[PDB]
């Protein structure tokens, strides 16, 4: 209902960042829940036809032994950011001879994202990232916007119908939630407003523990869906 050629919106924010957020809000839903021991990440991987090959590309990607992430927005930007995140983690490990903390990696990725909001002749990234990690026996969960502003959460959702997902999470969250219950709650949140039949091939689930981060095999996803 309004198009602006200026830099700052009348509400006091950057116009291009608002447009990038509008682009992000039209993507596939994503859900992240932090439990007492571990973090669970989930996303919707609905495909347009049976002609596709689900074993080709993945939306949940691991950065290192203990860090993984998921996105909601434009695929190519996520692909170009994942490689930079992995390179930064490897550089930190080479320099300091120790695994990078989650907060440092989030800070560096956010700085890289912010760099593109000030220069001329470029455009900001159109993605929002959810990052999970494990440090000193304590799970972490972060969310970053296209402008590079990050906050730490306990349960959050983005993409389509994220307000209803946030309401659902607020209504059905507990401080002493277990990993299995967290996975069940995340799958239920994804099932809410799915407009279809959920199988073990059209969703992706990843978990983080004290043993590291890994992506669930579709057999395990089918087993989890059997309980529901």
């Amino acid at each position: 209902y309004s198009f602006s050629l200026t830099t700052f919106s009348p509400s006091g924010k950057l116009v291009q960042i608002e447009y990038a957020l509008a682009a992000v809000a039209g993507g596939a839903p994503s859900v992240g829940i932090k439990a007492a021991n571990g973090v669970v990440l989930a996303t919707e991987k609905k495909q347009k036809s049976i002609l596709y090959d689900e074993r080709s590309v993945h939306k949940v990607e691991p950065i290192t032994k203990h860090i993984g992430l998921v996105y909601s927005g434009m695929g190519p930007d996520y692909r170009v950011l994942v490689h930079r995140a992995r390179k930064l983690a490897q550089q930190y490990y080479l320099v300091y001879q120790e695994p990078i903390p989650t907060a440092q990696l989030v800070q560096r990725v956010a700085s890289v994202m912010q760099e593109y909001t000030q220069s001329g002749g470029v455009r900001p990234f159109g993605v929002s990232l959810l990052i999970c990690g494990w440090n000193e026996g304590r799970p972490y969960l972060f969310q970053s916007d296209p402008s590079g502003a990050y906050f730490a959460w306990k349960a959050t959702a983005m993409g389509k119908n994220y307000v209803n997902g946030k309401t659902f999470l607020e209504k059905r969250y507990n401080e002493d939630l277990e990993l299995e219950d967290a996975i069940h709650t995340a799958i239920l949140t994804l099932k809410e407003s799915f407009e279809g039949q959920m199988t073990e091939d059209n969703i992706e689930v990843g978990i983080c523990n004290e043993a590291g981060f890994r992506r669930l095999t579709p057999t395990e996803v089918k087993d989890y869906l059997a309980a529901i």
Binding site: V80, H83, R84, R86, K87, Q90, Q91, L94, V112, E115, S119, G120, G121, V122
Partner: protein, 52 residues
């Protein structure tokens, strides 16, 4: 495998295209400003997945 080999195999156009792409991407450059990361330059140069 370098610019001379590419010119001898394909022609004069390939190194010219590569250098024009490099110059167009490198326009984000200034001395009195803060440190910068050359994401697009590393992607085009092909060294975005290796550590020097």
């Amino acid at each position: 495998m370098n610019f001379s080999t590419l010119r001898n195999i394909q022609g004069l156009f390939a190194p010219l295209k590569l250098q024009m792409e490099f110059k167009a991407v490198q326009q984000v450059q200034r001395l009195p400003f803060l440190s910068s990361s050359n994401l697009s330059l590393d992607v085009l140069r092909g060294n975005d997945e290796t550590i020097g």
